[PDB]
């Protein structure tokens, strides 16, 4: 079932190129028995794999309207029958679910997080740092990468399964494999 999957890593680490190998290759991403792909909705720019685009810029759209859909009122639309079952990749995710005061009020946008999965909603968040998001987000988290380079730029990909929240001090409790990508990952994708 749906599942939350935090990517971080400082800028031009290559977390929307991963993202994009993923989609490329990743068995949730294929066309069904129908030959129907689940759909895709994001702020990704110069994705060529159809998707339907969603605004995170809370001040050029806070909620969505007939022709266009804000991030921001995501706990509406998300749970309208053309959109269950759909996968949900966000990149910069803090401008959506920032870290927040401890004890204060949720966010509606955020409730219905911890009941993704009754809609069967798949989450990728990007970002560059974990703390930079809600700690109620990163709770639900349940595969994390983040991309550490050693500065002669070798690119490691560290994997838990929970949100790590300081990703290079915890390396020792990641799996390490090289950071790998689909050689076609530009015939998807321009920056």
């Known amino acids: 079932m749906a599942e939350i999957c935090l990517i971080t890593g400082t800028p031009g680490s290559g977390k ?5 190998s993923m989609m490329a290759n990743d068995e949730m991403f294929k066309p069904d028995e129908n030959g129907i792909r689940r759909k895709v909705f994001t702020n990704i720019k110069g994705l060529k794999i159809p998707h339907t685009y969603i605004e995170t810029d809370a001040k050029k759209l806070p909620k969505s309207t007939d022709e266009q859909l804000s991030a921001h009122d995501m706990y509406e639309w998300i749970k309208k029958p053309e959109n269950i079952g759909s996968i949900v990749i966000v990149d910069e995710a803090q401008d959506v679910w920032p870290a927040r005061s401890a ?4 966010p509606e946008n955020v409730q219905w997080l911890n009941t993704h999965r009754h809609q069967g909603i798949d989450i990728f968040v990007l970002t560059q740092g974990p703390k930079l998001l809600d700690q109620n987000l990163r709770t639900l988290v349940r595969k994390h990468y983040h991309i550490a380079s050693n500065k002669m730029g070798m690119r490691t990909l560290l994997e ?3 949100c790590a929240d300081d990703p290079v001090k915890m390396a020792s409790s990641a799996f390490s494999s090289i950071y790998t990508l689909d050689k076609k990952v530009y015939d998807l994708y321009e920056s």
């Open 160 to 162: 838990w399964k929970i």
């Open 16 to 20: 929307t190129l991963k993202m994009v």
């Open 103 to 106: 004890g204060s009020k949720i």
